[PDB]
Amino acid sequence: AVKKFKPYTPSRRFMTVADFSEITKTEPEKSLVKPLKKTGGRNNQGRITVRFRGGGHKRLYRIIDFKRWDKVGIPAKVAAIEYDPNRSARIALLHYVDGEKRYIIAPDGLQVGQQVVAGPDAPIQVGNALPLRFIPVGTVVHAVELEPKKGAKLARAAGTSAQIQGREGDYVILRLPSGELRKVHGECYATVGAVGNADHKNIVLGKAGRSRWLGRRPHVRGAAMNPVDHPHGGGEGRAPRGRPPASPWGWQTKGLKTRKRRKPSSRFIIAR
Amino acid sequence: MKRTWQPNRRKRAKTHGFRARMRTPGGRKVLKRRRQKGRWRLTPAVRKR
RNA sequence: UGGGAGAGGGUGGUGGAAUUCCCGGAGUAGCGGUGAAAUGCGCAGAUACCGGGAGGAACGCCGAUGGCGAAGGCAGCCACCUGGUCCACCCGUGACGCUGAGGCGCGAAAGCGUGGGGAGCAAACCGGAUUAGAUACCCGGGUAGUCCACGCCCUAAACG
RNA sequence: CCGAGGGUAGGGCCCGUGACUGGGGCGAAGUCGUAACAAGGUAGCUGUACCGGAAGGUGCGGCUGGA
RNA sequence: UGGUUCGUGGAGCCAUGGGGGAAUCUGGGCGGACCACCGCCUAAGGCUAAGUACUCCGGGUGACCGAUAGCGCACCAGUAC
RNA sequence: GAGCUAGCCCUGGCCAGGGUGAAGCUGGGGUGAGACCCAGUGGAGGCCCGAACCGGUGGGGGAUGCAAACCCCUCGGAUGA
RNA sequence: GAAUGCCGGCAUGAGUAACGAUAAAGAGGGUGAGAAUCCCUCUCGCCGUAAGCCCAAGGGUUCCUACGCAAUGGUCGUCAGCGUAGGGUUAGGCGGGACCUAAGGUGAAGCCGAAAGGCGUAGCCGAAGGGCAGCCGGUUAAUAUUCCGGCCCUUCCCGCAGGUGCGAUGGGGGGACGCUCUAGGCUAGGGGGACCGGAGCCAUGGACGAGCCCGGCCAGAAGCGCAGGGUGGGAGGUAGGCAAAUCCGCCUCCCAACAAGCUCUGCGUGGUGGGGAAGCCCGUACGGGUGACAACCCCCCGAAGCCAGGGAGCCAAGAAAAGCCUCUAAGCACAACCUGCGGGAACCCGUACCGCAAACCGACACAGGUGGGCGGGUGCAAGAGCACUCAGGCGCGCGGGAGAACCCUCGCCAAGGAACUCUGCAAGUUGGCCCCGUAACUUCGGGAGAAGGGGUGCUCCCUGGGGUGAUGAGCCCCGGGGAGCCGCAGUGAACAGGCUCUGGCGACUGUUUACCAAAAACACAGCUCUCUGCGAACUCGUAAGAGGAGGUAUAGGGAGCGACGCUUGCCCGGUGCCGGAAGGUCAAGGGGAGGGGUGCAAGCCCCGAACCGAAGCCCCGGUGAACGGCGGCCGUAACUAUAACGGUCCUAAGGUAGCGAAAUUCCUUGUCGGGUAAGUUCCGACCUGCACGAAAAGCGUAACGACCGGAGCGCUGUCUCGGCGAGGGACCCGGUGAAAUUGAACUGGCCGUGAAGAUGCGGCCUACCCGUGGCAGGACGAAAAGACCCCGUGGAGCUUUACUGCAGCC
RNA sequence: CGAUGUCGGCUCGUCGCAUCCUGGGGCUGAAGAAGGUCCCAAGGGUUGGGCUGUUCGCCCAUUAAAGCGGCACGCGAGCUG
Numbered sequence A: 001a002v003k004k005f006k007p008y009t010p011s012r013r014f015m016t017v018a019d020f021s022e023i024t025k026t027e028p029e030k031s032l033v034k035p036l037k038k039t040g041g042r043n044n045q046g047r048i049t050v051r052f053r054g055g056g057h058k059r060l061y062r063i064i065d066f067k068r069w070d071k072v073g074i075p076a077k078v079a080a081i082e083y084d085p086n087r088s089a090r091i092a093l094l095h096y097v098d099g100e101k102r103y104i105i106a107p108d109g110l111q112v113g114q115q116v117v118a119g120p121d122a123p124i125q126v127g128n129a130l131p132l133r134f135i136p137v138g139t140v141v142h143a144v145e146l147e148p149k150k151g152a153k154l155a156r157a158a159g160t161s162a163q164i165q166g167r168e169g170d171y172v173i174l175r176l177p178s179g180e181l182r183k184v185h186g187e188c189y190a191t192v193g194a195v196g197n198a199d200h201k202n203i204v205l206g207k208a209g210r211s212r213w214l215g216r217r218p219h220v221r222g223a224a225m226n227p228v229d230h231p232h233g234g235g236e237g238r239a240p241r242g243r244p245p246a247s248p249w250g251w252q253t254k255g256l257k258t259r260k261r262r263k264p265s266s267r268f269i270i271a272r
Numbered sequence B: 001m002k003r004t005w006q007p008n009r010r011k012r013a014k015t016h017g018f019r020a021r022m023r024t025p026g027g028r029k030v031l032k033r034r035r036q037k038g039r040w041r042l043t044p045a046v047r048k049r
Numbered sequence C: 001u002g003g004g005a006g007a008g009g010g011u012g013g014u015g016g017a018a019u020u021c022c023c024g025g026a027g028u029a030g031c032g033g034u035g036a037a038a039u040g041c042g043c044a045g046a047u048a049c050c051g052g053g054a055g056g057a058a059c060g061c062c063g064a065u066g067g068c069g070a071a072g073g074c075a076g077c078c079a080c081c082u083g084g085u086c087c088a089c090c091c092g093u094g095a096c097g098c099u100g101a102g103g104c105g106c107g108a109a110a111g112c113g114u115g116g117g118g119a120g121c122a123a124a125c126c127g128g129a130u131u132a133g134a135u136a137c138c139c140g141g142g143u144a145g146u147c148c149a150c151g152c153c154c155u156a157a158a159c160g
Numbered sequence D: 001c002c003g004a005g006g007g008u009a010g011g012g013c014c015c016g017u018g019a020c021u022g023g024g025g026c027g028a029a030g031u032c033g034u035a036a037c038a039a040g041g042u043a044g045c046u047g048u049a050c051c052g053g054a055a056g057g058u059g060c061g062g063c064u065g066g067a
Numbered sequence E: 001u002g003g004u005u006c007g008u009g010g011a012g013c014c015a016u017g018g019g020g021g022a023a024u025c026u027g028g029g030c031g032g033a034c035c036a037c038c039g040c041c042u043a044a045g046g047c048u049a050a051g052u053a054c055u056c057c058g059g060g061u062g063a064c065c066g067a068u069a070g071c072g073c074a075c076c077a078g079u080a081c
Numbered sequence F: 001g002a003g004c005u006a007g008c009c010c011u012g013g014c015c016a017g018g019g020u021g022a023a024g025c026u027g028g029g030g031u032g033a034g035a036c037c038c039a040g041u042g043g044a045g046g047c048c049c050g051a052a053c054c055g056g057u058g059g060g061g062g063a064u065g066c067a068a069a070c071c072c073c074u075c076g077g078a079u080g081a
Numbered sequence G: 001g002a003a004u005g006c007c008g009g010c011a012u013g014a015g016u017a018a019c020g021a022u023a024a025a026g027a028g029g030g031u032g033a034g035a036a037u038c039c040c041u042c043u044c045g046c047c048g049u050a051a052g053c054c055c056a057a058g059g060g061u062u063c064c065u066a067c068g069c070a071a072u073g074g075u076c077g078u079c080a081g082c083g084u085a086g087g088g089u090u091a092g093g094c095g096g097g098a099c100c101u102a103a104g105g106u107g108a109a110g111c112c113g114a115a116a117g118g119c120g121u122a123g124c125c126g127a128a129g130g131g132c133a134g135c136c137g138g139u140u141a142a143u144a145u146u147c148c149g150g151c152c153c154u155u156c157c158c159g160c161a162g163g164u165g166c167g168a169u170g171g172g173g174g175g176a177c178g179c180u181c182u183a184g185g186c187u188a189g190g191g192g193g194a195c196c197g198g199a200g201c202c203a204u205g206g207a208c209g210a211g212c213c214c215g216g217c218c219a220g221a222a223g224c225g226c227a228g229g230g231u232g233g234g235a236g237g238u239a240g241g242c243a244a245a246u247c248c249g250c251c252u253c254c255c256a257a258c259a260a261g262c263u264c265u266g267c268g269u270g271g272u273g274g275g276g277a278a279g280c281c282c283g284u285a286c287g288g289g290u291g292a293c294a295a296c297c298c299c300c301c302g303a304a305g306c307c308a309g310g311g312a313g314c315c316a317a318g319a320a321a322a323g324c325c326u327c328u329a330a331g332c333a334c335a336a337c338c339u340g341c342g343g344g345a346a347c348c349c350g351u352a353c354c355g356c357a358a359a360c361c362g363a364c365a366c367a368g369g370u371g372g373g374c375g376g377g378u379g380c381a382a383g384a385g386c387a388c389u390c391a392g393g394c395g396c397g398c399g400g401g402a403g404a405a406c407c408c409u410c411g412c413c414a415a416g417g418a419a420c421u422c423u424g425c426a427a428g429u430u431g432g433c434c435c436c437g438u439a440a441c442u443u444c445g446g447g448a449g450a451a452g453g454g455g456u457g458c459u460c461c462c463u464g465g466g467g468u469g470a471u472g473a474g475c476c477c478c479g480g481g482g483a484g485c486c487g488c489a490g491u492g493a494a495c496a497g498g499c500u501c502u503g504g505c506g507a508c509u510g511u512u513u514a515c516c517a518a519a520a521a522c523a524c525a526g527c528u529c530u531c532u533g534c535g536a537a538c539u540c541g542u543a544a545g546a547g548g549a550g551g552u553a554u555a556g557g558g559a560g561c562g563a564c565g566c567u568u569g570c571c572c573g574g575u576g577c578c579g580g581a582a583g584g585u586c587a588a589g590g591g592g593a594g595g596g597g598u599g600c601a602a603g604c605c606c607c608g609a610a611c612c613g614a615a616g617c618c619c620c621g622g623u624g625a626a627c628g629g630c631g632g633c634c635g636u637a638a639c640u641a642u643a644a645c646g647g648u649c650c651u652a653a654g655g656u657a658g659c660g661a662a663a664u665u666c667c668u669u670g671u672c673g674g675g676u677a678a679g680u681u682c683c684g685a686c687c688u689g690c691a692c693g694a695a696a697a698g699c700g701u702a703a704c705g706a707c708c709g710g711a712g713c714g715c716u717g718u719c720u721c722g723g724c725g726a727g728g729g730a731c732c733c734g735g736u737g738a739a740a741u742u743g744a745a746c747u748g749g750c751c752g753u754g755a756a757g758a759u760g761c762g763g764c765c766u767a768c769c770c771g772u773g774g775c776a777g778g779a780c781g782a783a784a785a786g787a788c789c790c791c792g793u794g795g796a797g798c799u800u801u802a803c804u805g806c807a808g809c810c
Numbered sequence H: 001c002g003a004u005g006u007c008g009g010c011u012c013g014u015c016g017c018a019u020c021c022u023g024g025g026g027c028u029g030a031a032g033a034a035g036g037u038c039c040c041a042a043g044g045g046u047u048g049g050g051c052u053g054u055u056c057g058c059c060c061a062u063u064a065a066a067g068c069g070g071c072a073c074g075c076g077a078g079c080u081g
């Protein structure tokens, strides 16, 4: 839906906030299962190695369930859907009859009170997790494992999915959010449905501060700098570059393919 | 204005203390040099309890 | 009350033909195209043929000089949801009617905003011919658009 | 107190005028090309969109005021 | 590749990171590419005094200084600052 | 050497008093149901005026200074990047 | 004898500048060898969201007392933060430690690195954060939540007495958390009182009065009372909480849904304990006594603080661990733990003093810098603002005169008002609150405090709402109406916008060259391109490892543009990038035709042509929100003029829209028009664009600005054109007393001359010796071994299709 | 070049005369008035504004006239910037 504001201030006239109506009466989270201390820090042991990180709201990590094959066969009741500061998506709090409480990343269409479960069994319904094999060709799916028993790694961003395209002996072909065509092992779990919160892309930050709230420090142009700092630094009053556009570290930034060629992963990929 | 000396006992101790110098080869040599020199004070005297 | 025809509308789903691209096989010296050509594609293996895969859009025959809607307009198939309408019986109400300034809704195509999609077609645009010259007609490419959702736009030989 | 009117400050409507600019009308015999009327030598007209010295061209759907 | 006077030189010898990879006296290395001959050594395990270097420390001496010299310091100096 | 300065991390603190009045609620109006319109309530914002605080705009002074960046007048931000 | 030499000494400037905020001093009396400067008393002034109190950091004897004045004190000094000595800092409850964890540090397991060493889940360390039991008074010259007095608590250990399956570093609960806005009830704090308590006081015309002045409190166990916070109680089932649980979780039935009940705080009350003014009298360097059997009561305002884990909203979604509760495991159930009561035990370190400053950071008794809490009263709409002033603390450690120039700061001005000037720079005008009233334009919010007005004091009369009290008196907050009074003037003092019109640039709030630039520069939301399928790309690192990210294409990196509106044309020949299992070229290696050296020979040792050999390059395509580029010359229309039209050369293609004398226009003050009496600027046009142009974006845009330009109104000492006055300096006297500079000097003008700008040389002219206040023409004055220029086979930072390498990638 | 601060403005002047005005004079194609031109003469005088950093210049309104030049394109230990 997206919340919109009137221009009672500049920067309030474009600003735009998510709709939280799917956030069920459960705004503060769940101890026990999560949260952990989350360790803010824009850099490695010592030095900054990703520029322009820092500031922005304190967070608690929700330790979510990315391998659903523990509770094969054990169903769970979806108890709530809550805000997760550390991902684009929303998260489902679910209660297993087992007693155990996990969070699943919350797919589009998930309703509270719903039944959900994981395993070879598993009715093909939104929320359920299955090894890729038993899932019908053509169904859209998410939180897909890359290699079996290694955890969900594909399609967890808000409003993303992959679609099952066909099969090939032990592998089923996937079409990933990027549009790539991937052979992913049959035995990999993946949960049916799309991610949801799909209006995430429609949000307009609206002002500088908002950027900072999310811990995004000001990014400065190479043009703004000096020859010591950047290939684009200097010279006089503005300058068009004077070389093929580059990163600060000298590599070209328009076109230069960067995936290493001899990756053994290659023989499992069929697209862009 | 604000000058450059902003005394802090803890800082002076953690920074220039006998135990800091002892911790690394760089520092151990400092004690060696100061000893051979005949320095009355190997490290700065940080006070208080 | 009881029936009947229909592409009337909305949503969800689904079927085959064909075009294009990808992959594999087989296969050669040309294919495309026009008034004639040229651009263009092709021994880096094209065209033509077989097999597999992908994707989008439009629904052949039935089909009519036919049906339906107030108009715009509506056509593969299926289910739901839904509007109008004609017949029969003459059963109920009992003049409850007709029209309609404004208002309000609807409203082809093109166009616009956001997001998606993109096979074929195709403004602009690039070439090749034609011409005195061609910013055209014809040919080879080709982007918006054409498709979908939501929101605008309110035009027409919106014509009987 | 009110009050003709004078003064100050800000608006509404109208008329005149203005370098320059837009198309329009009119002006017997100037230039460019040939769009329309015959099938006008690309049937025509059209709403819209883009493009072009110019008529105009083309995309899209529509009309018979064409076959 | 390093070492040697040896800077690729006709470049041996001595070490070695990489790849190939033997033999036990009629076995093996060397004598400056290489080969023949004549010779000299016996690798891939280790230890070994003395003769040599230095002067924190003690002593002796001086065509060494004599408080701006001589050690930074003749003096409670690596101190005051 | 980050006891100055720059950035980030952990953990605390600080921001007088006033304005303006967003959404959303509630009542009424309107419709077939709506949109929407009036109030009233509400208390939003890198919103406004202005101390503390953080600055450093213009001018004057100072120039072996009170000061190796100062003073006076003026001015910017002041619930936020 | 020179090195802007080095070290030391002493001069010159010179009794010169200065003596560190313009908050301010005067007198009397002491003391003393010696007083503007020390003590006392009186009068005067300054601070009072401090210039007063309390912490923290830092400092480290500066504290208190006695005796001192050589030096330190910008003077003096009998004084002191100084010299000598002596004394002073008292804790189970305050802070830190025998508690806990954060970032980070360290680090057994383990991983890595020539060595040194670098990583590293557990653990450990690590704190103004979590946890944890003392409040009020009194005494010292100097300590006190530490000593003493009262009242009240906390653990441990041993006893008894009574309970219970007790029992872990293990399980679970809790602890446990944001921002803004807030309700109820309290307390701190404050105001008033005809009431209570007090020494006193009637002054100078009046006042013996419900008169003036001062004060009417603090702490406090149990129990109560009043607020409020936490919390459901059963019984089954159980496969999860990494062993086990009766606990917790998840189902399922019952009764609660209430805070009823349990607890837990806060606040009142509370046995008892303590404080208790002015004034008057005393001797202090200060406190003591009396007032006193002091009284200790009633109303009102009232928190940002308490109840606290309160409520509501919102998006950016808001520490951990232990104490504590609970559950069970080993074990042990003569153990142990729980409750009550007794007795005993309770360590280590800090505690003085300064603490917005003379004791800390600034070489100084330095006008600078320094985190937290209390910060009274009155008035001005409010407030931590502003003026005055409680408590309290000060008069800033040179003074005395004088009343010049000149400077600083400040006050006023006839007439004129920007004529000033690069510029209204500066200064003025305006100024708070209430009430009318507000334009273009606009993104519908704004523009708006637009502009422009009126009101503002005091007295009396009537009157409407609340709040606390009971539905009333009072006390306190907001209002309305009517008469009237005074002055030049009523936010009568202090604090408090000048306004408009129109351009440029940037959307906006923000950021920046600490110490000459705050901007049109950076950033910014937003747009696009490109990479990256996850052990991702990229970044740091030799590595290990780490960030990215405990993220996964709606995500992450790189680049450019930079809200928003309308848009972003053509050129792929060159460079880049992307795509091309063909071809040419291409290294080690494979391959050995053939040839060489030695041997009597088997042999050993060399070169060595075919041919097979990657990436790269060549070559073929693609790609501009990739690097970039986007023409010349002739002719032509029935007045001239111009050229829709045509011809021709060249290019990879020959700038489209939109804009244009511009932040871009050389010629240029282009030319018209507008503003002016007059306009190289400004605004609007034209287009001949030296040398705009579409994401180093093009053209626009409301709002916004200590940005830059032009105009007008208002107002003025900016100016015509000055004048007067004030204080701080300057001047004189007493005290203390620098500086850069300095070849030595007995240091005049003119005209010449001289290395070409003479006090010093020639000639002439003038001129008794020595000072003081002033002015700045000269001493090519001082100051910095010119920073421009050039030189040196000097040096650095930067770039690239300069050379040569290296990391890195292939 | 072990430093001679560089345009313009302001303040303060002072000097040259090849004189802008004012005084004297000759020639005039000098009727008068008013000019032209040359000689003598520097004693005094030589205005306020618009534009521009400007010097200079171009304008507005006046004037007896709106003079030229030197003094380190006079004058920054006098100011501005």
Ligand SMILES: [Mg+2]
Pocket (backbone or CB within 6 Å): none
């Ligand atoms: Mg936790």
Ligand SMILES: [Mg+2]
Pocket (backbone or CB within 6 Å): none
């Ligand atoms: Mg480290």
Ligand SMILES: [Mg+2]
Pocket (backbone or CB within 6 Å): A219, A220, A221
């Ligand atoms: Mg940027």
Ligand SMILES: [Mg+2]
Pocket (backbone or CB within 6 Å): A224, A225, A226, A234
């Ligand atoms: Mg720069």
Ligand SMILES: [Mg+2]
Pocket (backbone or CB within 6 Å): A227, A228, A230, A231
């Ligand atoms: Mg560079």
Ligand SMILES: [Mg+2]
Pocket (backbone or CB within 6 Å): A236, A237, A238
């Ligand atoms: Mg440039």
Ligand SMILES: [Mg+2]
Pocket (backbone or CB within 6 Å): A231, A232, A233, A234, A235, A239, A240, A241, A242
């Ligand atoms: Mg550049």
Ligand SMILES: [Mg+2]
Pocket (backbone or CB within 6 Å): none
């Ligand atoms: Mg009937």
Ligand SMILES: [Mg+2]
Pocket (backbone or CB within 6 Å): C107
């Ligand atoms: Mg329509």
Ligand SMILES: [Mg+2]
Pocket (backbone or CB within 6 Å): none
């Ligand atoms: Mg359409």
Ligand SMILES: [Mg+2]
Pocket (backbone or CB within 6 Å): none
């Ligand atoms: Mg978008």
Ligand SMILES: [Mg+2]
Pocket (backbone or CB within 6 Å): none
């Ligand atoms: Mg086509």
Ligand SMILES: [Mg+2]
Pocket (backbone or CB within 6 Å): none
């Ligand atoms: Mg075509």
Ligand SMILES: [Mg+2]
Pocket (backbone or CB within 6 Å): C159
């Ligand atoms: Mg019709």
Ligand SMILES: [Mg+2]
Pocket (backbone or CB within 6 Å): none
């Ligand atoms: Mg007009």
Ligand SMILES: [Mg+2]
Pocket (backbone or CB within 6 Å): none
């Ligand atoms: Mg006209």
